[PDB]
Amino acid sequence: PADFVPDSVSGMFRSHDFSYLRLRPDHASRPLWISPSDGRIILESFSPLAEQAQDFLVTIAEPISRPSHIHEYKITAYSLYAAVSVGLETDDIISVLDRLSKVPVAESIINFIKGATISYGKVKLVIKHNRYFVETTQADILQMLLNDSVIGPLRIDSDHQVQPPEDVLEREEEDDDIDAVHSFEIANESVEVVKKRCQEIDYPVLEEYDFRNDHRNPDLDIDLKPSTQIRPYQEKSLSKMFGNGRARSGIIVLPCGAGKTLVGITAACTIKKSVIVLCTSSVSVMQWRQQFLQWCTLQPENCAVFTSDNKEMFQTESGLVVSTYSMVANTRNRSHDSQKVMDFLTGREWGFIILDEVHVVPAAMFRRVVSTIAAHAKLGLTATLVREDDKIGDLNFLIGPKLYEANWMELSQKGHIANVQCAEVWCPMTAEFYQEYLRETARKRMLLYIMNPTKFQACQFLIQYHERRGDKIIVFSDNVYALQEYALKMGKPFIYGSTPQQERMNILQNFQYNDQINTIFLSKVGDTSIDLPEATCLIQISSHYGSRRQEAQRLGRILRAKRRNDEGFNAFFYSLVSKDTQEMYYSTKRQAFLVDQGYAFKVITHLHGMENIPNLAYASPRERRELLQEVLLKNEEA
DNA sequence: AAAAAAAAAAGGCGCGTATATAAAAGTTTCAATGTATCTATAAACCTTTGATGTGTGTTTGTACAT
């Protein structure tokens, strides 16, 4: 509602029917011919020079970049919406498609492309010279201010004001769209629904949140601080929040943890206003304050963070703020002095708000921040946008769709993010558990899946292989119930939820730079803390449907957060896939976007040498049939 | 009734009472010095007991097959 779904929907514009091709225009003109109606991308015989052409292709659709002449392409509806930042000559892309009119030129698609170039940069929501107003700016969304009632009748005929930009400032459209068809000064009351009304009245309107163009502020408790540096993937995001008129903001999809505070530093530094920051959990947040927050540009003293047990200095500093949603994303609240903090900052006209990895966060709890801050601008930072909660209003119509993707196979040609060759070992199955798996019921069937004799024979082989060629391991699995049994039946450490803080320390200290106790297991809450800077030998064993997304996201921090820049980087991933079992199809459906990312995958049902393992307990299958007798228990508890 | 041994008894040897003369040899007594031997005593440990952050725990809000 306030936000819009439009941030997780790539792979579109595929305009082609049972008779798509028109009289091949590019048939004669063969310098370049992408799939037009689709928006697909394909080179032409009068034109093979590719590498420099990365950017032009970046404007449209999805490639196949292990393609030879070129990679693939596609149309994208909101994709043109993103392109407005440059906002170049619209027909030029069509003019570029002029040669690329491969079939008879799909003017309809071209119009669709002209349409594909309709919204972004054609935004419409008024603003005024140190205030906000009820007008509109570009053709794509112009009326998204003027004809309105929360933007038009919620646009107030006030003439013009920077100093007069405050009383109203039908709430602060300080982040209004492109502005000023006759712009009626914006008010102070009711856009918390406008953001909902927007797509409700479906205005593809390009929000704009300025750098100094709202003098409801003698611009407030920030200031520019640029000390930072840049790896090859920054600047676009930074200038991505400028546009036309006055500045703006948006949403960006990233493998996070890359000093994303630093990019957060800039835009906040570049508005000098009131801003707050948010992260998941005192479980999660502390990987932020002090190894990647001070090599940067901020003074050492200001901010406060709040848990009323992990509390700070509140009622104290005029400067900026930082908190957690789930803290107040709920009627959860520890010390009523929280409501000594709650009321203002909630009610406070924050210039900007920072939300981070809201991906897992549900509307059923995510709407609180929507109902909490309503800051004049917002930060969009999560893991993945194609989702399971693909529901109606994603945070876009609040902030925007994804602004910057990542880049993996050919920009990382500046910085190698950990060359991957994924492995899935296709271990067959025995009916012995499986027979009563044919007798099972609700997901307590899946426990039987965990009862596979094959995992063991391979499990050590993985440990053996890794150390037979001598590189240490990081493993992935689930369902601790017996997976914990696996651990100290693997000769390897056990890790489990519902665990005291004390014991968490003994895991790493005489363990990291040592070279002997070189194996690890993972829980379902421990993954919410950290992964080692070591052992990119990545082995999946056990997972679970739906979690697949975050499970796949869970795999992310290992490699992408790594940045070392060697020649090859012979790194690999591995996984356990017990054959003839309920999940692998869903795992293939999980695999369905594995090499989507270009980070590839190779399969081995059996390698050269899996059986080389003589230390496996249950070497003969009667212990595996002893296992059957233990296999009963929990599934006889079940 | 007669023989033998000890006491009853005194007077005097011979130097204590002074007593100073002086030398000659030696003693003992007094006080500073040295040392193992009591003790308290406060500074060592060990255990106790009252105050204490907090690991685990009752409500909130959750992807997720079911």
UniProtKB/Swiss-Prot annotation:
Binding site for ATP: L254, P255, C256, G257, A258, G259, K260, T261
Residue interval(s) of motif DEAH box: 356-359
Enzyme class: isomerase
Record keywords: ATP-binding, DNA damage, DNA repair, DNA-binding, Helicase, Hydrolase, Isomerase, Nucleotide-binding, Nucleus, Phosphoprotein, Transcription, Transcription regulation
All residue ranges annotated as the Helicase C-terminal domain in the record: 457-611
Locations listed in the record: Nucleus
Cofactor(s) in the UniProt record: Mg(2+)
GO biological process: one example: transcription by RNA polymerase II
GO CC term, one of those recorded: transcription factor TFIIH core complex
Sequence similarity: Belongs to the helicase family. RAD25/XPB subfamily.
Quaternary structure, from the entry: Component of the 7-subunit TFIIH core complex composed of XPB/SSL2, XPD/RAD3, SSL1, TFB1, TFB2, TFB4 and TFB5, which is active in NER. The core complex associates with the 3-subunit CTD-kinase module TFIIK composed of CCL1, KIN28 and TFB3 to form the 10-subunit holoenzyme (holo-TFIIH) active in transcription. An additionnal subunit, TFB6, plays a role in the dissociation of the SSL2 helicase from TFIIH after transcription initiation. Interacts directly with TFB6.
Protein's name in the database: General transcription and DNA repair factor IIH helicase/translocase subunit XPB/SSL2
Upper lineage: Eukaryota, Fungi, Dikarya, Ascomycota, Saccharomycotina
First-to-last residue of the parent protein present: 101 to 770 of 843
